[PDB]
Amino acid sequence: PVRVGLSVDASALGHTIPPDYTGLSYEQAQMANPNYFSGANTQLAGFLRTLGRQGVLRIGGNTSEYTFWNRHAKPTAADEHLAAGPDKGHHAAAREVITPEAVNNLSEFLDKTGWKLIYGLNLGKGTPENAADEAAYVMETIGADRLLAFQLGNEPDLFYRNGIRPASYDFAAYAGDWQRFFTAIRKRVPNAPFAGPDTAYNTKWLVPFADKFKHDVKFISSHYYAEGPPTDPSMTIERLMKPNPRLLGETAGLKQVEADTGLPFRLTETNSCYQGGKQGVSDTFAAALWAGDLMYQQAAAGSTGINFHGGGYGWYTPVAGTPEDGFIARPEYYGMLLFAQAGAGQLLGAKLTDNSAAPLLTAYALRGTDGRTRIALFNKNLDADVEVAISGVASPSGTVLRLEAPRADDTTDVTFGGAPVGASGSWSPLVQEYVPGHSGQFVLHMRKASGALLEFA
Amino acid sequence: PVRVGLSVDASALGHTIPPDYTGLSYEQAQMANPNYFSGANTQLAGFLRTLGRQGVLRIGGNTSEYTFWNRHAKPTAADEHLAAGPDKGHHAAAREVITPEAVNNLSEFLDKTGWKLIYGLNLGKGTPENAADEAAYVMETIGADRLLAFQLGNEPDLFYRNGIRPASYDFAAYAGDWQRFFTAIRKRVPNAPFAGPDTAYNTKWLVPFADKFKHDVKFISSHYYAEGPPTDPSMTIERLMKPNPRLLGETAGLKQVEADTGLPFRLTETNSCYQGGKQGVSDTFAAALWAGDLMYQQAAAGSTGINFHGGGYGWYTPVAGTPEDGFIARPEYYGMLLFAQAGAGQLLGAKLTDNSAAPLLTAYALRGTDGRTRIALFNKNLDADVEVAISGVASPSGTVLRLEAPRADDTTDVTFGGAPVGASGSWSPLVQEYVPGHSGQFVLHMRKASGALLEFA
Numbered sequence: 023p024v025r026v027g028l029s030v031d032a033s034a035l036g037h038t039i040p041p042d043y044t045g046l047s048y049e050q051a052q053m054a055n056p057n058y059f060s061g062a063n064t065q066l067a068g069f070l071r072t073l074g075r076q077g078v079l080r081i082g083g084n085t086s087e088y089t090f091w092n093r094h095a096k097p098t099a100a101d102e103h104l105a106a107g108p109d110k111g112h113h114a115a116a117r118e119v120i121t122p123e124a125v126n127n128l129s130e131f132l133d134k135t136g137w138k139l140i141y142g143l144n145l146g147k148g149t150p151e152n153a154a155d156e157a158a159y160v161m162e163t164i165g166a167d168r169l170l171a172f173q174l175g176n177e178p179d180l181f182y183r184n185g186i187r188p189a190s191y192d193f194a195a196y197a198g199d200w201q202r203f204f205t206a207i208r209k210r211v212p213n214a215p216f217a218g219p220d221t222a223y224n225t226k227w228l229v230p231f232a233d234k235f236k237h238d239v240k241f242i243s244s245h246y247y248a249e250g251p252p253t254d255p256s257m258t259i260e261r262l263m264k265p266n267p268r269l270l271g272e273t274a275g276l277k278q279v280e281a282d283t284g285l286p287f288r289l290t291e292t293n294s295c296y297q298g299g300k301q302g303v304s305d306t307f308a309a310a311l312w313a314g315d316l317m318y319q320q321a322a323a324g325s326t327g328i329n330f331h332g333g334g335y336g337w338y339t340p341v342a343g344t345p346e347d348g349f350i351a352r353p354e355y356y357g358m359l360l361f362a363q364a365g366a367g368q369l370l371g372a373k374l375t376d377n378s379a380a381p382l383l384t385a386y387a388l389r390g391t392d393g394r395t396r397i398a399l400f401n402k403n404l405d406a407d408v409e410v411a412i413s414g415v416a417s418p419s420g421t422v423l424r425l426e427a428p429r430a431d432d433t434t435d436v437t438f439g440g441a442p443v444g445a446s447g448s449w450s451p452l453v454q455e456y457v458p459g460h461s462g463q464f465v466l467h468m469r470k471a472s473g474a475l476l477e478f479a
Numbered sequence: 480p481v482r483v484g485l486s487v488d489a490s491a492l493g494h495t496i497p498p499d500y501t502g503l504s505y506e507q508a509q510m511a512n513p514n515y516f517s518g519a520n521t522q523l524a525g526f527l528r529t530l531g532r533q534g535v536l537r538i539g540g541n542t543s544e545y546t547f548w549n550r551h552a553k554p555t556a557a558d559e560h561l562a563a564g565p566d567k568g569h570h571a572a573a574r575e576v577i578t579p580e581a582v583n584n585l586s587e588f589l590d591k592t593g594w595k596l597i598y599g600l601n602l603g604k605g606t607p608e609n610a611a612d613e614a615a616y617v618m619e620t621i622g623a624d625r626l627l628a629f630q631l632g633n634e635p636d637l638f639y640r641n642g643i644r645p646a647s648y649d650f651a652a653y654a655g656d657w658q659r660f661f662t663a664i665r666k667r668v669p670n671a672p673f674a675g676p677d678t679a680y681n682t683k684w685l686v687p688f689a690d691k692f693k694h695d696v697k698f699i700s701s702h703y704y705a706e707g708p709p710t711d712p713s714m715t716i717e718r719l720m721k722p723n724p725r726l727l728g729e730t731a732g733l734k735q736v737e738a739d740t741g742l743p744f745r746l747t748e749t750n751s752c753y754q755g756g757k758q759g760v761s762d763t764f765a766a767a768l769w770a771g772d773l774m775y776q777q778a779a780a781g782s783t784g785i786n787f788h789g790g791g792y793g794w795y796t797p798v799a800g801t802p803e804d805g806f807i808a809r810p811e812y813y814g815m816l817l818f819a820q821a822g823a824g825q826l827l828g829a830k831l832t833d834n835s836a837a838p839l840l841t842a843y844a845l846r847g848t849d850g851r852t853r854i855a856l857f858n859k860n861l862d863a864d865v866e867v868a869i870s871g872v873a874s875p876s877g878t879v880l881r882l883e884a885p886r887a888d889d890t891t892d893v894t895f896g897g898a899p900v901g902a903s904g905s906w907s908p909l910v911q912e913y914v915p916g917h918s919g920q921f922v923l924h925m926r927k928a929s930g931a932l933l934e935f936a
């Protein structure tokens with residue numbers, strides 16, 4: 023093993039993680055099926071509760087430009103069996119209708135989970151008046167306490183690429199659209215909250231959006247995929263475990279926006295690989311390590327939260343399935359589960375030394391809201407075991423829950439705390455293990471391509 | 480859908496399925512780790528109970544020629560963490576030692592599960608006297624009620640191919656060995672029960688074995704892999720769903736042995752593809768359909784039982800994992816689960832008609848020991864949905880539990896009764912569905928590459 027030092031500093035205060043930090047993002051097309059986001063969907067509701075007692079459900083995505091609210095519509099027989107996976111971006115999605123029934127059923131789903139809602143409106147192809155009407159029904163049925171924000175279009179900077187607007191569409195044009203929709207909506211719903219611009223940090227769209235619309239939104243909404251442009255070497259597990267300088271830069275950009283406008287930021291759509299994911303990467307244990315680490319990295323940067331995109335049986339979905347067939351936890355879910363068990367609190371200094379031979383090991387220390395110290399570690403080195411000598415924690419007893427699979431590319435065999443997640447998100451730890459050492463010096467071994475959560479008495 | 484007819488005949492009596500029909504086979508090398516087959520292994524015990532309240536654990540395999548009992552040995556530190564997956568047959572396995580402690584722990588594992596034991600002795604490379612000593616300790620600790628049989632060597636017809644004996648080793652030579660071992664063992668254990676010859680049906684080994692040793696064994700033990708010789712086109716999902724004429728022939732051969740000697744037969748080692756399995760076939764939902772169907776086909780041929788080979792994280796293992804990391808149900812397990820829920824009873828006539836366009840659909844009807852009619856159906860056609868018109872059942876109510884995954888090659892997303900299996904074999908149905916129709920005419924739809932269990936009131 024590579025022998026590294028980890029030094030915890032209870033005085034090096036970072037950010038406080040909010041209790042609604044975790045979340046999921048889904049395609050708005052899924053709302054065509056009123057059985058999906060329903061009070062009767064107890065299995066899916068159970069998977070969300072396990073991910074956190076508070077969190078945020080975001081509904082939007084490319085399909086939000088192809089979904090059309092109608093106050094008189096009833097779902098058809100095909101609609102009652104629709105499971106809309108992440109949009110693969112290769113062409114126009116099918117047209118779908120959203121019904122009062124689906125909205126009513128969403129409000130019951132949110133009551134069963136305890137989660138809040140970010141809800142997409144159709145700015146790509148709809149009308150301001152139909153958006154106002156949809157926003158009104160959502161506000162009537164869901165309420166201002168569970169409705170966090172509406173968003174007016176998804177990835178407007180990509181409308182051109184995907185046939186929704188002409189090549190010439192730019193931020194100026196988008197700001198005109200945004201204003202027309204904001205104005206119509208606010209007439210019907212004077213207390214409507216908004217977030218935007220619902221894409222990746224950039225200077226042509228995100229920076230001017232925040233300057234112009236800072237008094238009209240509650241927070242900035244940004245997207246992030248670890249996969250870079252279509253021209254890069256395609257994503258591998260190896261690459262996914264390494265730092266992404268684009269991420270660090272886009273995160274800084276978001277912090278500067280915050281400094282300039284007062285607006286906080288949330289990562290409203292993210293996953294490993296775009297266009298639904300890549301088989302052999304996105305659907306593997308490696309995605310658990312990537313996702314768990316990402317949650318922590320963005321939290322330490324001052325992010326208000328996250329929403330991992332998914333649905334259907336897409337390669338990157340945290341939860342897979344249907345109401346007819348049932349739901350299961352995919353490998354990525356286990357990384358979010360580790361964050362769920364750690365809980366909220368305030369991040370602390372945790373400096374790694376002696377680690378140039380194991381450079382993809384990361385570590386985050388947290389003072390829990392219950393007063394206990396926790397450490398989340400991700401050994402993302404694919405070929406190096408580690409031995410971590412831990413100082414700066416005094417406690418009579420540490421325990422470890424391990425995040426494991428037998429290989430980094432496994433599509434199954436994933437456990438946390440020595441147990442799989444069962445039906446309806448059911449999980450409890452079955453193997454807990456004391457961390458050797460004592461107050462001021464603890465010693466933790468970790469295999470290559472594993473994770474761990476340490477909780478100190 | 481292809482519209483087919485299924486005609487149940489309560490008068491066309493087949494064989495009665497025994498309550499200990501189900502089972503698993505593992506490598507004897509695994510006995511080096513006393514924590515594996517242990518009373519403390521509650522997770523694995525739970526997966527076996529779910530597969531049936533009675534069944535049989537077989538321990539043997541290629542590693543049984545490389546495992547050496549020693550009455551004074553204690554397990555080492557490496558042994559305490561060994562997880563022995565199926566032997567891949569590419570070379571000699573590592574030498575392993577079996578300890579009293581491992582045997583004691585096995586007896587507690589068997590008490591927790593309610594299963595019986597077939598136990599391998601080392602005829603390949605051991606001595607008669609050490610086999611006698613091992614057989615004595617096993618009989619002392621496990622008892623005659625839970626010990627079903629000892630086996631003297633695994634696949635003796637392949638000893639040559641694999642370096643254990645010379646090219647010239649033949650049945651005559653094997654029969655000499657078998658006799659020397661039988662004689663030594665019976666001196667130490669006068670009531671020792673045996674089964675053999677622990678390979679595939681053939682005329683050079685299995686047929687003469689049964690003639691010569693019929694008064695010395697309780698039953699004939701045969702092996703079957705769907706994959707044929709190394710020279711055949713390699714196994715595909717497509718091929719796995721089709722009838723295997725080798726299987727039908729070897730099964731007939733076993734029935735003729737029974738007629739001639741009075742000896743029943745059990746399939747003591749089977750899976751889809753040999754040498755640990757093939758990735759993309761053995762580890763897929765297709766293996767669930769293949770395994771469930773196989774259980775039924777052999778039961779209808781008059782087999783006393785089955786033992787699916789597995790362990791570790793091998794491609795074909797029903798259950799994967801370790802005591803340190805936990806255990807999970809792989810796709811194949813779900814096929815055996817369907818048989819588990821159906822339960823024991825007596826098989827009935829069930830003739831399919833109008834089915835030349837959906838020729839890989841199979842169906843088995845059973846009068847349960849509780850008096851209710853059940854039908855197990857496997858739609859193994861990869862590209863054809865079916866609509867099954869069912870006659871010859873009178874009942875006020877049928878229900879269906881579905882065996883599903885979104886694609887035949889999926890390595891995960893497998894459900895039964897609308898639920899995954901959870902931790903420690905925990906399973907309950909979450910979606911049950913009434914079968915349309917009434918007494919004398921029921922109508923069941925099934926997707927391509929799915930399965931179903933129908934239970935009639």
Ligand SMILES: *[C@@H]1[C@H](O)[C@@H](O)[C@H](O)[C@@H](C(=O)O)[C@H]1NC(=O)CCCCCCCN=[N+]=[N-]
Nearest residue numbers: 083084108109111176247252296297298299
């Ligand atoms: C986010 C999107 O809103 C979802 O509908 C979609 O399913 C998801 C995904 O593709 O998996 C997300 N979309 C993207 O990340 C857009 C693709 C990234 C940029 C494409 C390359 C730029 N064009 N060129 N050349």
Ligand SMILES: *[C@@H]1[C@H](O)[C@@H](O)[C@H](O)[C@@H](C(=O)O)[C@H]1NC(=O)CCCCCCCN=[N+]=[N-]
Nearest residue numbers: 540541565566568633704709753754755756
């Ligand atoms: C049964 C065996 O006892 C297990 O140890 C082994 O793990 C299992 C497997 O290979 O997965 C089973 N072994 C076999 O089925 C033997 C291979 C079949 C015949 C090989 C080809 C014949 N030789 N040539 N040429």
